[PDB]
Amino acid sequence: SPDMKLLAGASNWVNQSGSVAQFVFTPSPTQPQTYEVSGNYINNAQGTGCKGTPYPLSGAYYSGNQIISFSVVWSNASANCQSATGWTGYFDFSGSQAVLKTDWNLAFYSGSTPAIQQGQDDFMQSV
Amino acid sequence: DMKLLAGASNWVNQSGSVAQFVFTPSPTQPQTYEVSGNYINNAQGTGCKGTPYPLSGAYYSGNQIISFSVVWSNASANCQSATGWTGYFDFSGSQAVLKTDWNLAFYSGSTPAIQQGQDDFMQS
Secondary structure (H helix, E strand, O other), X not given: OHHXXXXXXXXXXXXXXXXXXXXXXXXXXXXXOEEEEEEEEEOOOOOOOOOXXXXXXXXXXXXXXXXXXXXXXXXXXXXXXXXXXXXXXXXXXXXXXXXXXXXXXXXXXXXXXXEEEXXXXXXXXXX | OHHHHHOOOEEEEOOOOEEEEEEEEOOOXXXXXXXXXXXXXXXXXXXXXXXXXXXXXXXXXXXXXXXXXXXXXXXXXXXXXXXXXXXXEEOOOOOOEEEEXXXXXXXXXXXXXXXXXXXXXXXO
């Protein structure tokens, strides 16, 4: 049932930086056990751009073993950081509080030089 | 960078995997497109090769940066896993190249794992 609670709602998840992802799931019309991920992400990581306002997220979720991959392009009405982040990982519902474990890639430019930075985010569910 | 949006092109990686991207303007994000289309996997040693899987993601047109994902579930095979690619199009050379880093989340029995790699796709 933690699994179906996720599918029915808009759930919130806070990572170690204080940033917050809100996820909504819609069944795929062609892929079984698969959901289109929508929702928004608020970046609260110090030392970064594009903080404090929601950015849409998009991606896909596999309900069979609760694996997700989602992305944000850092462009909205408030700020544009000319970049995108992709997260891929898995939910763990085995503890008393649910956790989403992810690896991420941030593609961006520094002047004319492109780069892709790697990192890891652990999100803990908000109630 | 315009050829890319035009409609349908094939982007082929070092193993012969093929990404077929479709773009539609984002409802709320400036200079951004929703990405859809299909991915045909051919990565050596991997499951779910040789059939189209839908992909989804987002593309930033200002400097041609993309992030997209595939869940490995369709009517032909289910590998109970998902891959996310993030990277940038380099239109320097006579050959355009999409340079990406990817993560694959999967289970081995009861143990979850996330594997990393890199894929370079060339426009066919």
